[model samples]
Target: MSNNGGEPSNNGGEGAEGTCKEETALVAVKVVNADGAEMFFRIKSRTALKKLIDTYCKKQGISRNSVRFLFDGTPIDETKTPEELGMEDDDVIDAMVEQTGG
Candidate 1:
């Protein structure tokens, strides 16, 4: 578990901005914000993603609740944190801010 207060981390080193560890492969990520804005991250796992979202969203002044997680365009069960999803290397994960029908 991360102690980032719900933010992505730089993994204790400074290399490329928004880049993660070299040992970790970049997976596909697509996210939509509350204002209908879209963002993407090339990451490894849901854990890594949680860090990224927690950090980036706050920077954008968006609530975590304003977005939803998806794998292959389907919403993920909120009961599980990204790690629980058992994400693997190079898998595509998607999230969108727009929710339908309450």
Candidate 2:
């Protein structure tokens, strides 16, 4: 899997001085499907969780909103990044599918 992700680093903080110093890294996330299948993904720290979720939903043929990602029993937002979440390599994430009926 490719580790490349998200916007390009400007190499500086708001054009302050030299650069902001990019800290993107390859992270491994283990996902447990609702069907009892397990999957692993390699992503970059800077990549948004929504992107990953979208891709996973497409690949799994599931609805994006119907699923949610949880780390350490806490729901993770798409706006958050792996770096901000302090996610380490090989972190286990639970993907739960919510049942909705009308």
Candidate 3:
């Protein structure tokens, strides 16, 4: 039940001296699990969604390799890192765990 998230500062502007290109404006994702669990995940605004998932999985006794991610009702590429996806703010994310019966 820990709500501790990564420390990602608001650095979406010109870099030092205001002369360098800034990183894209990252978004925060609200995640909902199939079991009705909910959590707000700051995708790039805080950390990559994938990283957050992995950490959360380890903490929740779930395996990251067995989970499916859906962004805005569309299945996202599992191999794409959060940064590569270029998530924006207020994105809805669904993380489904595929339990194997074996």
Candidate 4:
């Protein structure tokens, strides 16, 4: 919910220079499996990735530690946020699960 309208202002004047403003949004991203199955989640930009990982793990009945998420071919962790990872609305991330017992 990146609400640009009706929000408090921090600038002293309109179009002030040397002032940096960042807007946050509650975006929905999709987690996809190798078979193309997907689960969508709505999360704030500040939300830790652990939340999303947990949701997918629970849905697939797998341990969070046993699975890893990859965004744009880069691995992501629980401590990272989507904003930090440069993710956008409806971005698709792949889930990789560790395998054992060859």
> Which residues of candidate 1, in runs, are more than 4 Å off?
1-46, 77-86, 99-102
Q: Over all chains combined, what TM-score does candidate 1 have?
A: 0.42
Task: For residues 4-98, write the lDDT of model 3, one tens digit per residue.
Answer: 33433332222112233455556676767889987875555544555556666777786555556667656553323433454557666677644
- Give the number of colliding residue pairs in candidate 4: 1
- In angstroms, the error of model 2 at 78 is 2.0
| Candidate 4 residue lDDT tens string, 1-102 | 574333332222111123335556676677788877777777765553556777777766865555557777766654243455665665557886544311
Residue 75, model 3: lDDT of 54
Each model's TM-score, in the order given? 0.42, 0.61, 0.54, 0.61
Q: How badly does each model clash, as a count of residue pairs?
A: 3, 4, 2, 1
- Which residue pairs clash in candidate 4? 1-26
Which 10 successive residues of model 4 have the least lDDT summed?
A: 8-17
Candidate 3 residue-wise lDDT at 69: 66
- TM-score of model 2 (CA atoms): 0.61
lDDT tens digits by residue: candidate 1, 1-102? 655234432222122224334453445555554466666666655245565557666877875655555656445533124434545443334555443221
lDDT (C-alpha, whole model) for all candidates: 0.49, 0.59, 0.55, 0.58
